[PDB]
Design an enzyme around this catalytic site. Structure first.
Site, PDB file in Angstrom:
ATOM      1  CG  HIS A  73      49.878  48.309  92.818  1.00  0.00           C
ATOM      2  ND1 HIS A  73      49.540  48.899  94.014  1.00  0.00           N
ATOM      3  CD2 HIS A  73      51.210  48.504  92.668  1.00  0.00           C
ATOM      4  CE1 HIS A  73      50.626  49.388  94.588  1.00  0.00           C
ATOM      5  NE2 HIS A  73      51.656  49.162  93.793  1.00  0.00           N
ATOM      6  CG  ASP A  99      46.400  48.656  95.123  1.00  0.00           C
ATOM      7  OD1 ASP A  99      46.567  47.502  94.684  1.00  0.00           O
ATOM      8  OD2 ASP A  99      47.336  49.492  95.165  1.00  0.00           O
ATOM      9  CB  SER A 114      53.289  49.214  96.570  1.00  0.00           C
ATOM     10  OG  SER A 114      53.388  50.512  96.028  1.00  0.00           O
TER      11      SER A 114
HETATM   12  C1  LIG Z   1      54.669  53.801  95.360  1.00  0.00           C
HETATM   13  C2  LIG Z   1      54.717  55.289  95.618  1.00  0.00           C
HETATM   14  C3  LIG Z   1      55.235  56.229  94.785  1.00  0.00           C
HETATM   15  S1  LIG Z   1      56.115  55.880  93.324  1.00  0.00           S
HETATM   16  O1  LIG Z   1      56.652  57.127  92.858  1.00  0.00           O
HETATM   17  O2  LIG Z   1      56.940  54.744  93.447  1.00  0.00           O
HETATM   18  N1  LIG Z   1      54.959  55.401  92.131  1.00  0.00           N
HETATM   19  C4  LIG Z   1      54.053  56.445  91.679  1.00  0.00           C
HETATM   20  C5  LIG Z   1      54.211  56.849  90.203  1.00  0.00           C
HETATM   21  C6  LIG Z   1      52.828  57.381  89.819  1.00  0.00           C
HETATM   22  N2  LIG Z   1      51.920  56.802  90.820  1.00  0.00           N
HETATM   23  C7  LIG Z   1      50.456  56.957  90.798  1.00  0.00           C
HETATM   24  C8  LIG Z   1      50.035  58.415  90.566  1.00  0.00           C
HETATM   25  C9  LIG Z   1      49.800  56.043  89.745  1.00  0.00           C
HETATM   26  O3  LIG Z   1      50.464  55.782  88.761  1.00  0.00           O
HETATM   27  N3  LIG Z   1      48.534  55.542  89.911  1.00  0.00           N
HETATM   28  C10 LIG Z   1      47.560  55.922  90.961  1.00  0.00           C
HETATM   29  C11 LIG Z   1      46.173  56.181  90.380  1.00  0.00           C
HETATM   30  O4  LIG Z   1      45.823  55.068  89.586  1.00  0.00           O
HETATM   31  C12 LIG Z   1      46.645  54.821  88.469  1.00  0.00           C
HETATM   32  C13 LIG Z   1      48.066  54.528  88.951  1.00  0.00           C
HETATM   33  C14 LIG Z   1      52.560  56.141  91.805  1.00  0.00           C
HETATM   34  O5  LIG Z   1      52.023  55.442  92.672  1.00  0.00           O
HETATM   35  C15 LIG Z   1      54.059  55.754  96.890  1.00  0.00           C
HETATM   36  C16 LIG Z   1      54.204  56.997  97.525  1.00  0.00           C
HETATM   37  C17 LIG Z   1      53.434  57.109  98.701  1.00  0.00           C
HETATM   38  C18 LIG Z   1      52.722  55.911  98.937  1.00  0.00           C
HETATM   39 CL1  LIG Z   1      51.672  55.644 100.256  1.00  0.00          CL
HETATM   40  S2  LIG Z   1      53.023  54.717  97.768  1.00  0.00           S
END
Ligand SMILES: C/C(=C\S(=O)(=O)N[C@H]1CCN([C@@H](C)C(=O)N2CCOCC2)C1=O)c1ccc(Cl)s1
Lengths: 232, 52
Positions: A42, A86, A183
């Site tokens: 990703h 991923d 990530s």
């Molecule tokens: C990168 C991140 C937190 S973030 O808030 O920056 N991005 C979020 C926003 C929504 N999502 C998920 C739910 C998401 O959009 N997905 C996952 C399921 O497949 C579609 C995309 C995130 O990863 C992480 C928290 C803990 C780990 Cl390990 S890394």
């Protein structure tokens, strides 16, 4: 990384940072060997052209070395909809020179990793991501010890599907987690003072939220794929 | 707990059970020591070691 501690000299030498045209970090990676970096598929959509920086612990100061990518090997089953599969491997144009703060993490054998590493109490996640859910990327490399989470407990906590290619780590309420920009980075597990690559920072419902955990790509699921990616 | 489930079969790194006994092995860049349990770095900057 929300919470955790700053990586001190030599503590996280396998960390890599993917940097855009503007030389800004947007994802992490793990050094596997002089020519190969492990990261999240990703992350490959978050920049059109990128390079890999190694040896840097402080983005405001120039051991660091910038490496251009020769080949990008993305898992063909990666899906933007669930973040399943991923994973990506980068072959660099020039080999990395190992030195203080620059060294590869070990890749474990599958069965043994499943029986011995994934059964440890904790692993370590690291990166230059945000230090609060809303915030600027960190200028300092951080790390955080994260408990492995029971597979049933994390499925119950999750609004999104947790596949066999993923695992959960972190805390239920304590305010510490990986976050945006982490990530692709390493999740490693120590065994007898040797650190083995066990996960790839993948996704989470926000950062450090009560009743939510961090979701990581399960490296044991892709050891043969990784091995194969490094041979060709 | 027996064999590999008893303190990793006394192996530094990988442990497998072949027949009814422990066989240890190591990651790339390490060589199995004479005792067949320890893993010795083949050169500088072995994988998985902090550079402290
Ligand atoms: C990168 C991140 C937190 S973030 O808030 O920056 N991005 C979020 C926003 C929504 N999502 C998920 C739910 C998401 O959009 N997905 C996952 C399921 O497949 C579609 C995309 C995130 O990863 C992480 C928290 C803990 C780990 Cl390990 S890394």
């Amino acid at each position: 990384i929300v919470g955790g501690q700053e990586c001190k000299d030599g503590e996280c030498p396998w960390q890599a940072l993917l940097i855009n045209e503007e030389n800004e970090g947007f994802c992490g990676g793990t050094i596997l060997s002089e020519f190969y970096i492990l990261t999240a598929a990703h992350c490959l959509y978050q920049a059109k052209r990128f390079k890999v920086r190694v040896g840097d612990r402080n983005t405001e100061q120039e051991g660091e070395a910038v490496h251009e990518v020769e080949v990008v090997i993305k898992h063909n089953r990666f899906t933007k909809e669930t973040y399943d599969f991923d994973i990506a491997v980068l072959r660099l144009k020039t080999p990395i020179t190992f030195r203080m703060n620059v060294a590869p993490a070990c890749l474990p054998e599958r069965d043994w990793a499943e029986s011995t590493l994934m059964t440890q109490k904790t692993g370590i996640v690291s990166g230059f991501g945000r230090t609060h859910e809303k915030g600027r990327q960190s200028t300092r490399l951080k790390m955080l010890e994260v408990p492995y989470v029971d597979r049933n407990s994390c499925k119950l906590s999750s609004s999104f599907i947790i596949t066999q290619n993923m695992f959960c780590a972190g805390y239920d309420t304590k305010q510490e987690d990986a976050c945006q920009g982490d990530s692709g980075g390493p999740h490693v597990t120590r065994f007898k003072d040797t650190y083995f690559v066990t996960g790839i920072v993948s996704w989470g419902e926000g950062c450090a939220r009560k009743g939510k955990y961090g979701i990581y790509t399960k490296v044991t699921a892709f050891l043969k794929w990784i091995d194969r990616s490094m041979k060709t | 707990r027996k064999l590999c489930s008893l303190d990793n079969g006394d192996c530094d790194q990988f442990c497998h059970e072949e027949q009814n006994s422990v066989v240890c092995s190591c990651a790339r860049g390490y060589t199995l020591a004479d005792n067949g349990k320890a893993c010795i770095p083949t050169g500088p900057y072995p994988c998985g070691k902090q550079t402290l």
